[PDB]
Amino acid sequence: PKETTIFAMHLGKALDPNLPVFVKAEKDTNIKLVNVASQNQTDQIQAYNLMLTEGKLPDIVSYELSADLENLGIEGGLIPLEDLINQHAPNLKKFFEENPRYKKDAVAVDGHIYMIPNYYDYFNIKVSQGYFIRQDWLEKLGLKEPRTVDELYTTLKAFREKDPNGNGKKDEVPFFVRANNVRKVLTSLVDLFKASPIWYEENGMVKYGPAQKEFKHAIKELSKWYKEGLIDEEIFTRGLESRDYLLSNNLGGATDDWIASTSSYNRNLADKIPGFNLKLVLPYELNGNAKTRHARTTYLGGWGISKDAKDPVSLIKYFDYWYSVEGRRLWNFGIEGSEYTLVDGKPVFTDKVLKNPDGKTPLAVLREVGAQYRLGAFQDAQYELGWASESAKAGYKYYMDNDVVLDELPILKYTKEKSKEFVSIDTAMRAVVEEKAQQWILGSGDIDKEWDAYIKRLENLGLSKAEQIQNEAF
Ligand SMILES: CC(=O)N[C@@H]1[C@@H](O[C@@H]2OC(C(=O)O)=C[C@H](O)[C@H]2O)[C@@H](OS(=O)(=O)O)[C@@H](CO)O[C@H]1O
Ligand SMILES: [Ca+2]
Numbered sequence: 001p002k003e004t005t006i007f008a009m010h011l012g013k014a015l016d017p018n019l020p021v022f023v024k025a026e027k028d029t030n031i032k033l034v035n036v037a038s039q040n041q042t043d044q045i046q047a048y049n050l051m052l053t054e055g056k057l058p059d060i061v062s063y064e065l066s067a068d069l070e071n072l073g074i075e076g077g078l079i080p081l082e083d084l085i086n087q088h089a090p091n092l093k094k095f096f097e098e099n100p101r102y103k104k105d106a107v108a109v110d111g112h113i114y115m116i117p118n119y120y121d122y123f124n125i126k127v128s129q130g131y132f133i134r135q136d137w138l139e140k141l142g143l144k145e146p147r148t149v150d151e152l153y154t155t156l157k158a159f160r161e162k163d164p165n166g167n168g169k170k171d172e173v174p175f176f177v178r179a180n181n182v183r184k185v186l187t188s189l190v191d192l193f194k195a196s197p198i199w200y201e202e203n204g205m206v207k208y209g210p211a212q213k214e215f216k217h218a219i220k221e222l223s224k225w226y227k228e229g230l231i232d233e234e235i236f237t238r239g240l241e242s243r244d245y246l247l248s249n250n251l252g253g254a255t256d257d258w259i260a261s262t263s264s265y266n267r268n269l270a271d272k273i274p275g276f277n278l279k280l281v282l283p284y285e286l287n288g289n290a291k292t293r294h295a296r297t298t299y300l301g302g303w304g305i306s307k308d309a310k311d312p313v314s315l316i317k318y319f320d321y322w323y324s325v326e327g328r329r330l331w332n333f334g335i336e337g338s339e340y341t342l343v344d345g346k347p348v349f350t351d352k353v354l355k356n357p358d359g360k361t362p363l364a365v366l367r368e369v370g371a372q373y374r375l376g377a378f379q380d381a382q383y384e385l386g387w388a389s390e391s392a393k394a395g396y397k398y399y400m401d402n403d404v405v406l407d408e409l410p411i412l413k414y415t416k417e418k419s420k421e422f423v424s425i426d427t428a429m430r431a432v433v434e435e436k437a438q439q440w441i442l443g444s445g446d447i448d449k450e451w452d453a454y455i456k457r458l459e460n461l462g463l464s465k466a467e468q469i470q471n472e473a474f
Helices: 020-029 044-053 066-074 082-088 090-098 100-106 135-141 149-161 182-193 213-227 242-248 259-263 312-321 325-333 362-368 381-387 390-401 416-442 447-461 463-473
Strands: 002-007 031-035 060-063 116-119 129-134 173-176 199-202 205-208 252-258 278-281 299-305 340-343 346-349
Touching (some): 002 044, 002 312, 020 325, 031 312, 044 060, 060 066, 066 299, 066 416, 082 090, 090 100, 090 312, 100 116, 100 299, 129 135, 129 259, 149 173, 149 182, 149 213, 149 252, 173 242, 182 213, 182 252, 182 416, 205 463, 213 416, 213 447, 242 252, 259 390, 278 390, 299 312, 325 346, 325 381, 346 381, 416 447, 416 463, 447 463
Parallel strands (some): 002 031, 002 060, 173 252
Antiparallel strands (some): 060 299, 116 299, 129 252, 129 278, 199 205, 340 346
């Protein structure tokens, strides 16, 4: 039993090493994790920043913001991993040889590997979020599927004013999202208006979404839709239970969310809410623009080994376990005999996952046993296809066939000094954007009056320089 400290959080939950997935990994690797994040910590960014002030770093550092994680490596807080991998991690060594695109995500500008990313199975499923609407509410109200942003507005107004759930109460929440921070709230609200809360590419040049006039229009419209009760009054506070609560209580009319898990609700709620039909639609058009910027990235976050770890060879072997056939299946599918059984060598989920007796969705069940816990593992799209509905599978093809998805801007990497400057500027601007976007949507500030000063604020923090660093690394 080798006691190993780790900082690990995901989706607001500190990693619990007693979950079945990590109990099994413990038996197989003799690595017994001890989290330095405590169970009452739910803000991963503030916990990470606090962790950096505490003196000694944990043996393993996991973080969702890979640019900050790689900066920690450039400063010597994380050790280079490439020699440890070549000598001691045959599964990772093979993975990097077989996947040069993924290897590029792992290599810093100085040539060192400071982190193993948590890879999506990008080359098998590359879409992420889509737009959904309560088709049973459309039929109930005699309305057609809205195809433009303006028609969506009118439709949501009808959802709010005309009692589609039939209980004589003005309780409908026409449009809702799912998030545990402000960035994720904005992410699923501003794409409607063809804006972006982050950096994006136009025509070979990298630009900052929140500084564009499309973002101003998005926020201005959302403030109006907020006042009229068309978007959830609790958008910024409802948290990750939002979709579960609003759909299962028959309150929510439409959303922008991950395709497979959102498609799970039709079967999940079929008995509780007879006729429930939350249906995927193509992104609503705005003046002929039919695109969404929602796309899966090649990876999200990662983990590394800190300079303070006593036994890095043992830890790279732990990293390598998740890239073995058995370790990767464990991370993706859960426990054999509980979450899945092997049928002709291939995992097939059990009733516990696919028809959960406590009314849980399949992915919620998997996360509760420790599967899909973001660290530095390699997702297997067969896990997702194993529980995705037929409508979800058609939905992937629907979005791809109709060419509505724009690829995400890759997470660029920089030389040491530029990488210190960029993350400093990007972090500072992020705080300003999330402050003003909330005030503007909630009605406590006037965006028409304040936009120009906001821009100047971003410029004062270094927006021009950040863009310049961006276009150098592109
Ligand atoms: C790598 C990871 O854990 N990413 C989180 C997302 O997880 C994906 O969600 C779905 C889905 O259908 O919802 C399918 C993909 O296979 C998953 O990897 C997702 O987490 S959650 O929806 O399961 O809670 C999003 C939610 O914001 O968060 C990512 O971190
Ligand atoms: Ca009602």
